[PDB]
Amino acid sequence: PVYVDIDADSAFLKALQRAYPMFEVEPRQVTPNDHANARAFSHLAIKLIEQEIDPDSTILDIGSAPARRMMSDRKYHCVCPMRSAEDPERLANYARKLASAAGKVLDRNISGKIGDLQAVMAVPDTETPTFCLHTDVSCRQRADVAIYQDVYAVHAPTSLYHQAIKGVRLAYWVGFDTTPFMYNAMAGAYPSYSTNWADEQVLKAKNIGLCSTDLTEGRRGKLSIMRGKKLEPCDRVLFSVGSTLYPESRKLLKSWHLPSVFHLKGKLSFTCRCDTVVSCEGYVVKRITMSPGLYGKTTGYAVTHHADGFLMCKTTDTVDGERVSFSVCTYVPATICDQMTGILATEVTPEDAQKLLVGLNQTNTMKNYMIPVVAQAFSKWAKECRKDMEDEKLLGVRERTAFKKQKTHTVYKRPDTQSIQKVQAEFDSFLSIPLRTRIK
Amino acid sequence: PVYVDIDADSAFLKALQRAYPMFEVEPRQVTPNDHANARAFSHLAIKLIEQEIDPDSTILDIGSAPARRMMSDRKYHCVCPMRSAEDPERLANYARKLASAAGKVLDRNISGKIGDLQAVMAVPDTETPTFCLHTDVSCRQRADVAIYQDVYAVHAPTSLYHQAIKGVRLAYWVGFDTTPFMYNAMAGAYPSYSTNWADEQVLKAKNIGLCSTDLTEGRRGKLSIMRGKKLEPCDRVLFSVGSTLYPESRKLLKSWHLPSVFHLKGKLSFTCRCDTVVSCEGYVVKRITMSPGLYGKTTGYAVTHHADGFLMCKTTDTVDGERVSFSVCTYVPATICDQMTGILATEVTPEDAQKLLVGLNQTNTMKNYMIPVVAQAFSKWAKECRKDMEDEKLLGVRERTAFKKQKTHTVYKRPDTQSIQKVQAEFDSFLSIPLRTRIK
Amino acid sequence: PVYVDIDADSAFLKALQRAYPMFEVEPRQVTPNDHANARAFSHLAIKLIEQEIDPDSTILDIGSAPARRMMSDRKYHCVCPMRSAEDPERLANYARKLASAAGKVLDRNISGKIGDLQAVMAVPDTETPTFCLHTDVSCRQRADVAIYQDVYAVHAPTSLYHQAIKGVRLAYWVGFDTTPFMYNAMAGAYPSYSTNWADEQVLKAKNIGLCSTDLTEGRRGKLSIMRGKKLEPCDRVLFSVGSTLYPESRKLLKSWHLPSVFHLKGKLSFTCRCDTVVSCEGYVVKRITMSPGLYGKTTGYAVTHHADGFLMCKTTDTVDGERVSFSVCTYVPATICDQMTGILATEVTPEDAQKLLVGLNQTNTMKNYMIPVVAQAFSKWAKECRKDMEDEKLLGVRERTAFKKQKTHTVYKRPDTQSIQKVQAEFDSFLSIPLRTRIK
Ligand SMILES: Nc1ncnc2c1ncn2[C@@H]1O[C@H](CSCC[C@H](N)C(=O)O)[C@@H](O)[C@H]1O
Ligand SMILES: Nc1ncnc2c1ncn2[C@@H]1O[C@H](CSCC[C@H](N)C(=O)O)[C@@H](O)[C@H]1O
Ligand SMILES: Nc1ncnc2c1ncn2[C@@H]1O[C@H](CSCC[C@H](N)C(=O)O)[C@@H](O)[C@H]1O
Ligand SMILES: [Zn+2]
Ligand SMILES: [Zn+2]
Ligand SMILES: [Zn+2]
């Protein structure tokens, strides 16, 4: 019986029961976290990780939070280099949790982490069997399973290779769904988990989940010195999970949309297969299985199965004040898309579409905070499907002179469709002094 | 009592009970697999195979996943050449499951596969009685029954001949229905099992089960250097089942719609009969019975019986941006097609057809993700029948000048019809070092 | 209590109870056969045969499937020449069934067929008392009763004469009803048993139970080199029962519509009477009683009694693309015809007729897959009856100038009418080496 922090009356519990049917979910609250769904899914994924793997295995935990995964009965190796401002707080939490259960729990080898902590505090470059300060590039101890607890700032191919050299059989990756990023979207929804992401340039917008603007009077004279004339996504993107803000890199995050099969040829060439074992409203658990040698041929395509609908809409917003049009992605629950099918056949206006949507939402299924844009996406999809209907062409014959590109303003992946996108598969090229006293 | 992965509340269970009436199906979930129906049907077909065949027989398992079919009480011989990227994972799973039940299950001859695995690891060219690295062309062990567990990249005539030489009495083949591919369609449906296939050229579409497009602005200038001017299917096709992507060859898969009776004349000439013993919403189980000698005369025709309706619709879509009209195939449940019969007699618009279809879907019978296409197919079939009504011709009199070819935009095979197409019947012409250590 | 394969909830069971009232039918499924009704009727007919005939008799079985009729307590003689591609697999099934019950069932004289099988395997030209490799023309052992288990490629007069010379008192024939073939139709229905037939030329149609076409664009230039300008039936016809495709010859199949009484004059002249003892939705059991000598005078006419209505409609279809009009035959249940009698009095359009048909079909009485055609037949029959009404002629006075033939486009035999058709009655003129090892 697994225990979950989410409130008992929350509907997301049911979704969790669908995401983890092999585990019995029991809700109870200890903290009123603004973001409880994400931690609940992470805990369930960790429990499934414990269940699936072989107990007689060494589990690498890259980007680890040592305090969380120390009460586990398995033998973990935490690899937490000091590359973020969050790391010192986690080291403090680990220190308190170690010197709060050292002599009161026996069957957890707590003295092992105690001695390893003393050793690493003494020598910063010592490879302890349960705690390592090195990076994934230069970690040392051989293991067989790797766990990525929501690590988003790392290059997937290089890290996978540098850990496959060490001998991992199979690595799991729990986190957010990468497809909205490989679609080149500006802002995101992840409505159930209350996590919204936005690009740096579109931060000062008005009508997205992640924005903040200021009221102005009738000045058409702000006269910016710098003129770009190209609103394209950039590398830096900011996530807001509950009340905590985290910066990610677009390239590093987008690199996690691994193909179904791929190869890593270097000094030692391995082959790998990646599949989604658990998916729930945006949170995914990928299973990249290591394999020595160079077997088979790779296609170069990545597949995503959308259990619930995906909606990439074209919305105008006042970014920094100026009206600009950009693409925003949204996740729509399966039932809402299911019931909004007959209506999505006519020439429907955004007003009528949004009225029907709120009437459909009754207890809420989807967050009402982001159904001015779902209605817009549905209206534009109806527009496109219609204009496609009475523009029926001829078999096997295009119209090339140079050929006409006609308008696509929204992408509506139905709650049972799958998306293939091309992704590269043939990967070829790959402490502080006061803190030492603070260790005690 | 057979045990099935699919959820208890899923309607597809009933279909399974219709597909396997001799077997009692009991539902329970161990994993939340995105694709559960396909594995369910595969397991049920394997249990049917165990029931039907003679226990005192040697069963060739070509393209085998040895881990799954090793717990069986029969004496299987797995043939798993390293021709796919998944094969290393299959060998790893076999190794773990062998060294996880070696000394705790007795009546399964586990030590046999243990010793045979050591033998093949030692000598890669040794034909062990339960495991081999060879290809179906060059396998050695004599047997009497062959099993094809969803093998899709192989030529049916050559493989059947090369195994019939070895002495198989009868070979079963469980897989997808090959009927849509001899119909020369671009995209596929298989709605119940959530498996959608698409051609190479139509991957970047908008309104099929398997597509992914990007929003673009008003640029009628993409100016492609290469101009084809012929939208015809090619050999490469991509399947997406659940979240896994599998590449298939159009010719190799199309070769599996074998005629009712056919002959294989070579050094030794055999005769064979192929029949569909199990069929459910697309999944089929063919029964090709070997027979030495040359008796009878072949018709050269292959029959598919459609328990549920088949729809070949002509849909426009913006592939890579450019709008073209291509053909998509769809499976419609028998109940929906049955209730939509009298309505399919009028001059019905796609709007009214889609509204009435979504009304008929109430709990869902068919997946609502693909009823803009079914409605269009029904409307066009009504159009064709209506035009066919008042164009009555004379007995035995054609109109040849060179004679008029008037248009069919959809093929609607009713849920009790049979479709025959001409297929060729007179078939005339026919490990790495680190993995070796990884075997332990 | 007869034991039947067809599903318990199916309506056809009721019809079966009407076809065999002397037998108690108990349903259950052992296989999910696509075609279960046909095998059900065949088994019921065989059991009726067992009850009717004298136990102290020798029963010839032409075109035998020895495996099926071996468990019977009576003494059969199977005559199964290698004249079809199905024969080898039937022999293999016979061999397995013989060497699967040789020493565990006693009161069936199994060792008899064992020894006779060894004898024929040794000498291919040996007339064993329970198995024979000769044809019906050149079979040897004298008997008194003959059975035709759905044998379809044989000339009825020649076979009947060559068996009556051997001394058969009476021969039964279980099969499909031959009236639609003597009516010169292109496509057939047999809706209850899900078996559809069609001529070679109309294979590539669109709107029959047996067709397969391909979508095309507006090319009115296919320019066939060969021009026939005549759409008439040919000898070759394709049957599709469930998922099984069988070829028949039109002349041989039409020869089975034997008259009520006929004579065979040769070296020995016999007299025979043919009658239908059991009829159900298309399946018939004829009972041809032999008699030595030349007694009585023959009328030369054959009568078929239609328990359920018969409909020959004139439908236009795109055969290979070209629109041509041909005749299709259909069986309509008695209840539907009875209820649609008042409506069949007015000028009714095909639209209204089909709407009332689907409304009458509610659970389904007749298969909805084929009620575009029944509606057209009913509408055109109503048109013919109407035009027949206000065109009253004078008593016994024709109008001959050469006399006017006016148009019949459908033949509607009511569910209590009988059809008389002229058929000729005065009939005047009439293994491999590896298989031998496979016998073991
Ligand atoms: N290249 C790299 N190799 C190993 N760890 C890295 C890394 N880059 C960043 N990290 C670490 O990964 C952590 C991500 S924060 C995530 C912490 C924890 N997995 C959780 O989900 O709660 C950071 O603390 C950072 O120190
Ligand atoms: N020509 C051939 N002869 C024998 N096996 C082949 C083959 N071509 C491909 N294969 C094997 O067939 C496998 C198909 S993947 C199918 C695995 C398993 N039957 C399942 O359904 O789960 C591949 O792993 C490949 O190694
Ligand atoms: N002229 C002939 N004389 C005797 N048998 C013949 C024949 N022509 C064909 N046959 C046999 O008749 C068989 C018809 S298939 C019918 C099999 C069985 N009676 C059943 O209904 O299931 C063929 O196998 C063929 O071998
Ligand atoms: Zn380390
Ligand atoms: Zn082998
Ligand atoms: Zn004989």
Side-chain angles (χ1 to χ4, degrees), chain A residues 1-8 10-88 90-120 122-219 221-228 230-250 252-296 298-398 400-434 437-440, chain B residues 1-8 10-88 90-120 122-219 221-228 230-250 252-296 298-398 400-434 437-440, chain C residues 1-8 10-88 90-120 122-219 221-228 230-250 252-296 298-398 400-434 437-440:
Chain A
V2 84
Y3 274 175
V4 165
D5 184 43
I6 196 49
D7 185 26
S10 172
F12 179 63
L13 183 79
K14 279 334 226 163
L16 271 203
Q17 245 159 30
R18 238 179 320 288
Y20 304 90
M22 81 305 297
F23 279 3
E24 308 84 341
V25 198
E26 247 312 359
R28 76 176 36 171
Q29 302 223 243
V30 178
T31 83
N33 273 9
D34 325 299
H35 47 297
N37 302 354
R39 184 54 61 190
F41 194 91
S42 288
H43 191 198
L44 258 287
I46 288 305
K47 282 294 180 37
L48 176 141
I49 277 304
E50 294 226 22
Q51 179 114 2
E52 190 22 75
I53 76 156
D54 153 32
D56 282 344
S57 310
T58 37
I59 308 81
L60 291 198
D61 184 358
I62 286 279
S64 181
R68 173 165 329 105
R69 274 191 291 310
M70 149 283 292
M71 288 279 71
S72 170
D73 36 1
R74 328 210 104 78
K75 28 192 193 315
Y76 281 99
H77 173 209
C78 327
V79 191
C80 44
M82 297 337 192
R83 296 305 99 72
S84 56
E86 145 158 355
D87 307 340
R90 284 333 97 78
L91 257 301
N93 200 341
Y94 200 42
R96 316 213 305 167
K97 264 309 302 298
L98 261 291
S100 66
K104 305 133 281 298
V105 57
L106 305 169
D107 55 300
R108 209 65 75 190
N109 173 23
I110 300 303
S111 59
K113 322 85 188 78
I114 284 284
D116 289 340
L117 259 293
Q118 270 96 60
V120 60
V123 186
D125 206 4
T126 281
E127 210 74 11
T128 89
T130 203
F131 189 153
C132 165
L133 302 203
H134 281 259
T135 318
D136 75 29
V137 181
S138 80
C139 193
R140 230 161 290 295
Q141 156 193 212
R142 174 151 290 81
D144 72 21
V145 173
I147 282 316
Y148 281 32
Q149 181 86 93
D150 321 61
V151 165
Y152 294 77
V154 68
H155 198 219
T158 60
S159 183
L160 284 181
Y161 188 156
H162 277 237
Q163 291 178 253
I165 280 186
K166 288 182 291 177
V168 46
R169 281 201 321 291
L170 158 72
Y172 305 65
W173 182 94
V174 307
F176 279 167
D177 203 340
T178 319
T179 84
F181 284 100
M182 248 287 288
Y183 265 112
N184 279 6
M186 265 305 162
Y190 298 86
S192 266
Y193 304 72
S194 58
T195 86
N196 295 306
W197 57 275
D199 156 16
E200 221 82 354
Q201 338 182 295
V202 298
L203 275 200
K204 322 211 158 273
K206 214 175 73 73
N207 289 10
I208 57 199
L210 204 51
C211 64
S212 100
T213 167
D214 196 350
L215 300 184
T216 88
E217 74 113 355
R219 159 280 307 286
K222 43 201 188 317
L223 258 62
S224 280
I225 46 176
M226 222 91 93
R227 175 188 173 184
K230 47 173 272 165
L231 199 43
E232 325 287 38
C234 65
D235 185 26
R236 214 161 301 111
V237 60
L238 317 182
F239 278 54
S240 42
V241 278
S243 147
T244 84
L245 160 78
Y246 291 150
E248 336 317 335
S249 164
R250 194 69 81 89
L252 298 185
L253 185 40
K254 186 204 272 282
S255 87
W256 280 98
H257 213 177
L258 270 301
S260 149
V261 316
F262 59 87
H263 298 349
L264 329 176
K265 19 188 173 66
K267 294 177 182 294
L268 316 98
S269 64
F270 298 11
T271 64
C272 261
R273 136 167 191 192
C274 170
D275 62 347
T276 307
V277 69
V278 162
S279 180
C280 154
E281 210 38 68
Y283 250 101
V284 317
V285 189
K286 291 199 211 345
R287 274 191 71 280
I288 328 172
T289 166
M290 301 325 168
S291 84
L294 205 70
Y295 307 149
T298 76
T299 36
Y301 286 123
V303 155
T304 298
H305 174 88
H306 302 131
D308 283 15
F310 198 48
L311 254 203
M312 218 172 82
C313 188
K314 176 74 146 300
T315 174
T316 43
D317 272 354
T318 53
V319 158
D320 205 16
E322 161 180 56
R323 168 167 308 128
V324 285
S325 100
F326 50 75
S327 59
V328 298
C329 60
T330 319
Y331 281 67
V332 189
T335 176
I336 274 278
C337 280
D338 214 8
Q339 263 176 89
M340 191 145 288
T341 310
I343 294 296
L344 260 181
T346 82
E347 211 161 15
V348 68
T349 63
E351 173 170 353
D352 278 0
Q354 150 168 181
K355 189 77 63 33
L356 266 275
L357 268 160
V358 47
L360 254 294
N361 225 318
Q362 294 143 50
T363 309
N364 288 356
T365 300
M366 94 175 323
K367 314 301 270 283
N368 284 94
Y369 95 89
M370 148 157 292
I371 85 188
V373 70
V374 170
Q376 219 185 335
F378 280 172
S379 174
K380 294 264 189 42
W381 186 67
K383 262 311 160 293
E384 294 333 279
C385 260
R386 197 48 84 99
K387 228 47 63 173
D388 205 17
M389 187 71 29
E390 321 96 310
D391 271 14
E392 167 41 55
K393 303 332 192 83
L394 283 60
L395 251 203
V397 173
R398 302 86 169 190
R400 294 226 188 165
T401 60
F403 54 118
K404 172 73 72 170
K405 145 40 61 172
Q406 248 192 326
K407 259 298 174 91
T408 307
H409 271 168
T410 186
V411 167
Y412 175 40
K413 305 315 287 204
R414 262 75 64 91
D416 220 334
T417 43
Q418 321 103 332
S419 167
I420 287 157
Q421 286 181 29
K422 217 179 251 299
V423 152
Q424 172 199 19
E426 274 334 312
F427 293 130
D428 177 359
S429 185
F430 305 82
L431 206 62
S432 210
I433 286 96
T437 311
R438 201 74 151 174
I439 300 305
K440 171 50 49 179
Chain B
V2 85
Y3 274 11
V4 83
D5 194 332
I6 189 56
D7 185 26
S10 173
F12 179 65
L13 190 87
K14 263 68 125 162
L16 263 161
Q17 250 162 19
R18 237 179 319 287
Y20 300 88
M22 51 199 172
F23 283 32
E24 310 85 341
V25 201
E26 268 292 325
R28 82 191 69 251
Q29 303 224 70
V30 179
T31 36
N33 246 16
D34 325 300
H35 48 298
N37 303 354
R39 184 55 60 190
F41 185 95
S42 288
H43 191 199
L44 259 287
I46 288 305
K47 215 68 60 193
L48 171 147
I49 280 307
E50 295 227 22
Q51 181 116 3
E52 178 23 41
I53 83 189
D54 165 351
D56 282 345
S57 310
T58 38
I59 312 78
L60 286 211
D61 185 358
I62 277 275
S64 182
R68 154 190 335 112
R69 263 180 310 290
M70 150 287 306
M71 286 267 94
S72 168
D73 53 28
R74 317 216 172 289
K75 20 186 192 304
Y76 281 99
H77 175 207
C78 314
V79 191
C80 43
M82 301 331 203
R83 273 329 91 74
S84 95
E86 141 193 352
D87 306 340
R90 288 309 94 102
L91 248 194
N93 192 341
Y94 203 43
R96 315 213 305 166
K97 263 291 317 297
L98 260 291
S100 66
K104 309 133 287 295
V105 57
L106 305 169
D107 55 299
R108 205 61 90 201
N109 173 21
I110 299 304
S111 59
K113 321 86 186 78
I114 284 283
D116 290 340
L117 251 192
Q118 270 97 60
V120 47
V123 186
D125 217 354
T126 282
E127 209 72 13
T128 89
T130 202
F131 184 111
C132 33
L133 299 211
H134 278 257
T135 278
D136 67 15
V137 179
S138 81
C139 192
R140 205 71 41 72
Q141 156 137 330
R142 315 303 297 296
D144 72 39
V145 175
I147 271 286
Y148 283 20
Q149 180 83 93
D150 317 65
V151 164
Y152 278 94
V154 69
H155 198 219
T158 61
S159 183
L160 284 180
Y161 182 34
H162 276 237
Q163 292 177 276
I165 272 175
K166 287 183 292 177
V168 47
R169 238 180 323 263
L170 157 72
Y172 309 68
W173 182 94
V174 53
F176 284 163
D177 199 340
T178 41
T179 298
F181 303 60
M182 210 93 48
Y183 264 91
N184 279 7
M186 288 282 173
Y190 303 66
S192 286
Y193 321 74
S194 58
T195 89
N196 296 307
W197 57 275
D199 179 18
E200 220 73 8
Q201 320 182 328
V202 298
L203 271 163
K204 302 187 158 12
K206 204 162 81 53
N207 289 10
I208 55 199
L210 199 49
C211 53
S212 89
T213 167
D214 230 353
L215 306 181
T216 89
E217 48 91 6
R219 172 271 304 289
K222 43 201 189 316
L223 258 62
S224 280
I225 46 176
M226 143 74 61
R227 176 187 173 183
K230 51 173 282 155
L231 186 71
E232 297 295 1
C234 49
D235 186 27
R236 235 159 300 104
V237 58
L238 286 304
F239 273 77
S240 56
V241 52
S243 147
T244 81
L245 158 72
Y246 290 166
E248 318 303 335
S249 161
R250 194 70 81 86
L252 298 184
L253 185 41
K254 194 192 281 223
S255 87
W256 280 98
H257 215 201
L258 296 172
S260 149
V261 300
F262 58 57
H263 298 350
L264 328 164
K265 29 184 176 55
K267 293 178 182 294
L268 318 199
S269 34
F270 295 23
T271 65
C272 260
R273 152 183 188 144
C274 162
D275 47 311
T276 307
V277 66
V278 201
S279 181
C280 155
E281 223 75 30
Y283 252 103
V284 316
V285 191
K286 314 182 151 33
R287 265 191 71 260
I288 327 172
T289 166
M290 298 339 160
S291 84
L294 211 56
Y295 334 103
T298 74
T299 85
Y301 284 160
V303 157
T304 299
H305 174 89
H306 303 131
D308 283 15
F310 197 50
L311 265 179
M312 254 206 78
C313 177
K314 217 88 216 178
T315 174
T316 42
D317 247 13
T318 55
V319 47
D320 205 16
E322 164 182 58
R323 184 191 300 71
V324 295
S325 86
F326 52 73
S327 59
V328 299
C329 52
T330 307
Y331 280 66
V332 188
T335 283
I336 274 278
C337 263
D338 184 23
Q339 287 190 80
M340 193 133 288
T341 309
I343 286 327
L344 260 181
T346 84
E347 214 166 15
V348 68
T349 63
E351 178 157 47
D352 282 330
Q354 159 163 14
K355 199 141 317 286
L356 211 53
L357 268 160
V358 80
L360 255 299
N361 223 320
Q362 295 140 42
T363 309
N364 288 356
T365 301
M366 79 183 307
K367 294 302 191 33
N368 284 95
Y369 94 89
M370 148 186 87
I371 87 183
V373 162
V374 171
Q376 206 179 148
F378 278 170
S379 174
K380 290 232 179 58
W381 184 67
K383 280 305 153 286
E384 296 334 276
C385 276
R386 174 63 31 110
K387 210 85 37 189
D388 204 15
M389 209 30 78
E390 327 80 16
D391 270 16
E392 193 77 356
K393 298 326 188 73
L394 283 60
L395 257 181
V397 173
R398 298 108 173 205
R400 295 226 189 164
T401 61
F403 55 120
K404 171 72 72 172
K405 157 42 95 154
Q406 273 173 61
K407 283 314 121 169
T408 89
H409 283 322
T410 185
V411 166
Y412 175 42
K413 273 334 314 182
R414 264 71 71 91
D416 218 31
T417 45
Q418 307 87 332
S419 166
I420 330 170
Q421 296 186 30
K422 190 177 265 272
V423 198
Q424 179 194 13
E426 262 326 316
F427 292 152
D428 182 10
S429 185
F430 310 87
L431 206 62
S432 211
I433 287 98
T437 311
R438 200 74 151 174
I439 301 306
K440 174 19 54 180
Chain C
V2 77
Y3 269 174
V4 79
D5 192 330
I6 171 58
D7 185 26
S10 100
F12 181 60
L13 161 73
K14 294 332 181 193
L16 248 174
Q17 254 174 2
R18 240 162 308 288
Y20 304 89
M22 51 204 128
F23 284 30
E24 310 85 341
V25 199
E26 249 313 359
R28 56 201 66 132
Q29 303 224 40
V30 177
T31 84
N33 248 353
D34 316 88
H35 49 297
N37 304 354
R39 184 54 60 190
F41 194 91
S42 288
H43 191 198
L44 260 305
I46 287 305
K47 282 294 182 38
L48 175 148
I49 283 316
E50 292 227 22
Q51 173 143 350
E52 197 23 77
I53 80 184
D54 153 33
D56 283 344
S57 310
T58 38
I59 316 86
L60 291 199
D61 185 358
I62 313 325
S64 181
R68 174 165 330 106
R69 264 181 310 290
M70 149 276 275
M71 286 266 95
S72 169
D73 43 358
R74 314 212 133 77
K75 27 190 194 316
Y76 284 91
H77 173 210
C78 309
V79 190
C80 44
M82 311 325 188
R83 281 326 87 71
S84 100
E86 157 217 320
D87 307 339
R90 296 319 60 63
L91 241 192
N93 192 356
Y94 202 39
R96 316 213 305 166
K97 264 309 302 298
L98 261 291
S100 66
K104 311 134 288 296
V105 57
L106 305 169
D107 55 299
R108 208 65 81 200
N109 163 18
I110 299 304
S111 59
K113 324 86 163 52
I114 284 284
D116 306 342
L117 261 184
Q118 270 97 60
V120 47
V123 186
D125 217 354
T126 282
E127 209 73 13
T128 89
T130 204
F131 172 102
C132 164
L133 265 206
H134 282 257
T135 190
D136 78 18
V137 180
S138 100
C139 193
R140 209 68 44 74
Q141 151 190 231
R142 319 295 300 275
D144 72 13
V145 174
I147 278 274
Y148 284 51
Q149 180 84 93
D150 320 58
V151 164
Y152 274 90
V154 69
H155 197 219
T158 61
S159 183
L160 288 183
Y161 181 35
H162 277 237
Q163 286 178 296
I165 289 204
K166 287 183 291 177
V168 46
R169 273 183 356 264
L170 157 72
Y172 314 66
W173 182 96
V174 55
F176 283 145
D177 173 278
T178 41
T179 298
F181 284 110
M182 251 280 319
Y183 255 89
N184 278 6
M186 291 285 168
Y190 303 81
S192 283
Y193 321 72
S194 57
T195 166
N196 297 307
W197 57 277
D199 173 20
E200 211 77 2
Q201 336 200 293
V202 298
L203 241 193
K204 304 173 169 358
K206 203 175 52 73
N207 289 10
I208 39 184
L210 195 140
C211 67
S212 80
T213 166
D214 194 351
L215 312 182
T216 177
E217 70 143 3
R219 171 277 300 282
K222 44 200 188 316
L223 258 62
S224 281
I225 46 176
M226 142 55 75
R227 176 187 172 184
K230 79 168 266 144
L231 199 43
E232 321 286 38
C234 95
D235 185 26
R236 224 181 310 161
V237 57
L238 283 319
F239 271 39
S240 62
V241 198
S243 178
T244 75
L245 164 83
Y246 299 13
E248 335 305 321
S249 163
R250 195 71 82 87
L252 299 184
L253 181 39
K254 184 182 281 193
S255 87
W256 269 122
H257 215 202
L258 296 170
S260 149
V261 300
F262 57 51
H263 300 350
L264 330 171
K265 20 189 169 53
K267 294 178 183 294
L268 314 88
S269 54
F270 295 30
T271 37
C272 325
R273 148 185 208 179
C274 168
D275 47 33
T276 307
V277 70
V278 152
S279 180
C280 154
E281 223 74 8
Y283 251 102
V284 315
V285 192
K286 305 218 189 0
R287 199 170 84 99
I288 327 172
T289 166
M290 298 336 183
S291 85
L294 215 73
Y295 282 8
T298 73
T299 88
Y301 298 61
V303 154
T304 300
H305 174 88
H306 312 316
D308 283 18
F310 194 49
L311 265 179
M312 226 167 51
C313 182
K314 214 86 217 177
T315 175
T316 42
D317 276 344
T318 53
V319 160
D320 204 16
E322 165 181 58
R323 204 181 330 251
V324 284
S325 84
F326 49 74
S327 59
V328 296
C329 73
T330 310
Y331 281 66
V332 188
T335 170
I336 273 280
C337 276
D338 265 282
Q339 287 192 80
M340 206 162 281
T341 310
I343 321 311
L344 264 180
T346 89
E347 211 165 15
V348 67
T349 63
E351 178 129 10
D352 289 7
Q354 154 166 180
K355 193 146 316 302
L356 243 180
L357 268 162
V358 47
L360 254 295
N361 224 318
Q362 313 164 30
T363 309
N364 288 356
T365 300
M366 87 165 158
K367 322 302 280 292
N368 283 94
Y369 93 88
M370 149 210 81
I371 72 160
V373 164
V374 172
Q376 227 198 9
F378 278 171
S379 173
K380 265 205 209 48
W381 182 69
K383 242 54 81 163
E384 267 335 278
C385 261
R386 191 40 72 67
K387 215 73 69 219
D388 204 14
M389 195 48 61
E390 322 96 310
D391 271 15
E392 166 130 36
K393 312 320 290 283
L394 279 275
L395 262 63
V397 174
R398 298 109 173 206
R400 295 226 189 164
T401 61
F403 56 121
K404 171 74 73 170
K405 140 60 69 168
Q406 266 178 265
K407 294 318 132 171
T408 304
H409 272 346
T410 169
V411 166
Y412 175 41
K413 293 327 278 193
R414 262 75 76 81
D416 203 77
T417 44
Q418 304 92 301
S419 167
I420 295 195
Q421 285 185 86
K422 249 206 159 167
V423 185
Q424 177 196 16
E426 265 337 285
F427 294 130
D428 187 359
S429 185
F430 309 87
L431 206 63
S432 209
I433 287 97
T437 311
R438 201 74 150 175
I439 301 305
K440 150 39 43 178

